[PDB]
């Protein structure tokens, strides 16, 4: 696999050992061949597991989630997928890695898709080798793949709201359950219902993931309510997965706004990754997978693929060339390569709006391509009346950096900046000039 001009897809089923057994063997051989290597982790939780499995080996951890001594002579770097794309974007020298190992190479976040594109172009150009590790490579149509122990699969009506009757099977279970909901707001409602019935619930989402995941190991729990974030290597000591089979999809309507369409069916890869949380211990057969709907290829027309093209168009590769998206997923977006390329100053603003401002890729591009500087928040208030953001059924209000009380009405409307209470809180701080 380590030979140049080769992209290997390590499509071993969930729980085969692609991090504890396979990853250390690859690292040993790369170190032996003097190959400059990058290991890409989907999350900081997965990067911490990798440190444990690669202990002793000379690896430079470019993550604060690891507290180890660095010798200074390490030719293998380890960082998250977003950290990799971020460094490609910033005016920082990134080594020309000979070997590129991406773990959970199915991750659909804009920065993961952009890293797959950039790396796969280098491999296609004959400049490097790559190993994409995932049980569900792009294109998979199997929602029920092989597992370490048998799984009982049940098509059942899964609740998406609080319930009084009709779902005795949910609460009459003794084991621990991982329940995949389509959104934070939907998880809050089910969690309240379970808590009221006497259950201990932990809630996981992209923002609370590193902090809350530790509670799954430090305290007794009956249920873990999670969004699609737990599809990227989250390991649980559970015996049941309840899968609504639904998700929200960010969609660009008319090219002027982003809405959160759905809930709608998850792809076959998401259903297999969600089911993949259980059936992992061959000494405990009979884990349950209760699923509440079917699968469809809903990644077509999803904003993340357009956003990945916005990132790649602003990453230098070779003079006037631009990295293509990884071939099995290049059709999920109708885009022109280079159409999102920004000039040096607008590109710096774009990067700062995503990195410091914490705005979604699409929103940062709208603002940066309009000639607006990072600290100028006038656009958060000069939009049309239908762009008014609502909180508690009343227009959301902030005090501007000028000390004036205004209604939040952004020039560009992205549903993700007000999807939950936490998102709107951070966006109110942004519009106020707080970061």
Residue 383's nearest CA partner among 359, 407, 362, 405 is 407
The tokens describing 287, both together, are 């884990």
For residue 354, state whether it binds ligand ZVH (rule: CB under 6 A): yes
Phi-psi category of residue 233: left, alpha or beta, with phi > 0 → left and psi -120 to 50 → alpha: left
Choose between 360 and 383: whose C-beta lies nearer to ligand ZVH.
Answer: 360
For residue 363, state whether it binds ligand ZVH (rule: CB under 6 A): no
- Find out whether 15 is annotated in a ligand binding site: yes
List phi, psi (to 5°) of 291.
Answer: -115, 135
- Find out whether 17 is annotated in a ligand binding site: yes
- Find out whether 421 is annotated in a ligand binding site: no
- Find out whether 294 is annotated in a ligand binding site: no
For residue 102, state whether it binds ligand ZVH (rule: CB under 6 A): no
- Give the Cα separation of 122 and 261 in Å (integer): 35
How would DSSP label each residue in 47-71? HHHHHHHTTTS--EE-STT------
- Least gap, CB of 284 to ligand ZVH (angstroms): 35
Choose between 84 and 221: whose C-beta lies nearer to ligand ZVH.
Answer: 84
Residue 198 CB burial class (10 angstroms; 0-12, 13-18, ≥19) = exposed
Choose between 110 and 279: whose C-beta lies nearer to ligand ZVH.
Answer: 110
x-or-dash pattern for ligand ZVH, window 111-140, by CB under 6 A? Answer: x-----------------------------
Q: Of 1-9, 45-53, 79-87, 367-375, which segment contacts ligand ZVH by CB under 6 A?
A: 79-87
Give the count of residues interacting with ligand ZVH (CB under 6 A). 10
Q: Which of 19, 85, 186, 244 binds ligand ZVH (CB under 6 A)?
A: 85
Rounded to a whole number of angstroms, the CA Rg of the chain reads 22
Residue nearest to ligand ZVH (CB): 111
CA distances from 129 to 12, 96, 114 (A): 19, 11, 17
Cα torsion angle, 126, 129, 132, 137, sign: positive
For residue 216, state whether it binds ligand ZVH (rule: CB under 6 A): no
Q: Of 28-36, 38-46, 105-113, 389-397, which segment contacts ligand ZVH by CB under 6 A?
A: 105-113
Binding residues for ATP, by number, are: 12-19
């Amino acid at each position: 696999m380590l030979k140049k001009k080769q992209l290997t897809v390590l499509d071993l089923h969930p729980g085969a050992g692609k991090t504890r057994r396979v990853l250390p063997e690859i690292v040993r051989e790369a170190i032996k061949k003097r190959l400059r290597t990058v290991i890409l982790a989907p999350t900081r939780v997965v990067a911490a597991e990798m440190e444990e499995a690669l202990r002793g080996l000379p690896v430079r951890y470019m993550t604060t989630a690891v507290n180890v001594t660095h010798s200074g002579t390490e030719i293998v770097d380890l960082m998250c997928h977003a950290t990799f794309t971020s460094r490609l974007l910033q005016p920082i020298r990134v080594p020309n890695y000979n070997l590129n190992i991406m773990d959970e190479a199915h991750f659909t976040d804009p920065s993961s898709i952009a890293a797959r594109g950039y790396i796969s172009t280098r491999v296609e150009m004959g400049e490097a080798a790559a190993i994409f590790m995932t049980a569900t490579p792009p294109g998979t149509r199997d929602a029920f793949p092989d597992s370490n122990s048998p799984i009982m699969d049940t098509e059942v009506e899964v609740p998406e709201r609080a319930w009084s009757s009709g779902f005795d099977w949910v609460t009459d279970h003794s084991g621990k359950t991982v329940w995949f909901v389509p959104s934070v707001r939907n998880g809050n409602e089910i969690a309240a219902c379970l808590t009221k019935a006497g259950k201990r619930v932990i809630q996981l989402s992209r923002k609370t993931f590193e902090t809350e995941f530790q509670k799954t190991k430090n305290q007794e729990w009956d249920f873990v309510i999670t969004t699609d974030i737990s599809e990227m290597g989250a390991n649980f000591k559970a015996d049941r997965v309840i899968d609504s089979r639904r998700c929200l999809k960010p969609v660009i309507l008319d090219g002027e706004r982003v809405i959160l369409a759905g809930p709608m069916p998850v792809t076959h890869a998401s259903a297999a990754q969600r089911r993949g949380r259980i059936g992992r211990n061959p000494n405990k057969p009979g884990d349950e997978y209760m699923y509440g709907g079917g699968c469809a290829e809903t990644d077509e027309g999803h904003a993340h693929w357009l956003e990945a093209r916005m990132l790649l168009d602003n990453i230098y590769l070779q003079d006037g060339l631009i990295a293509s998206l990884y071939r099995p997923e290049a059709d999920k977006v109708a885009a022109i390569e280079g159409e999102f390329k920004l000039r040096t100053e607008q590109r710096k603003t774009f990067v700062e709006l995503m990195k410091r401002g914490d705005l979604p890729v699409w929103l940062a591009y709208q603002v940066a391509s309009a000639g607006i500087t990072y600290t100028d928040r006038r656009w958060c208030f000069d939009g049309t009346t239908n762009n008014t953001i609502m909180e508690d059924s009343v227009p959301a209000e902030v005090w501007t950096k000028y000390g004036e009380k205004r209604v939040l009405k952004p020039r560009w409307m992205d549903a993700r900046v007000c999807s939950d209470h936490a998102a709107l809180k951070s966006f109110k701080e942004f519009a106020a000039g707080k970061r």
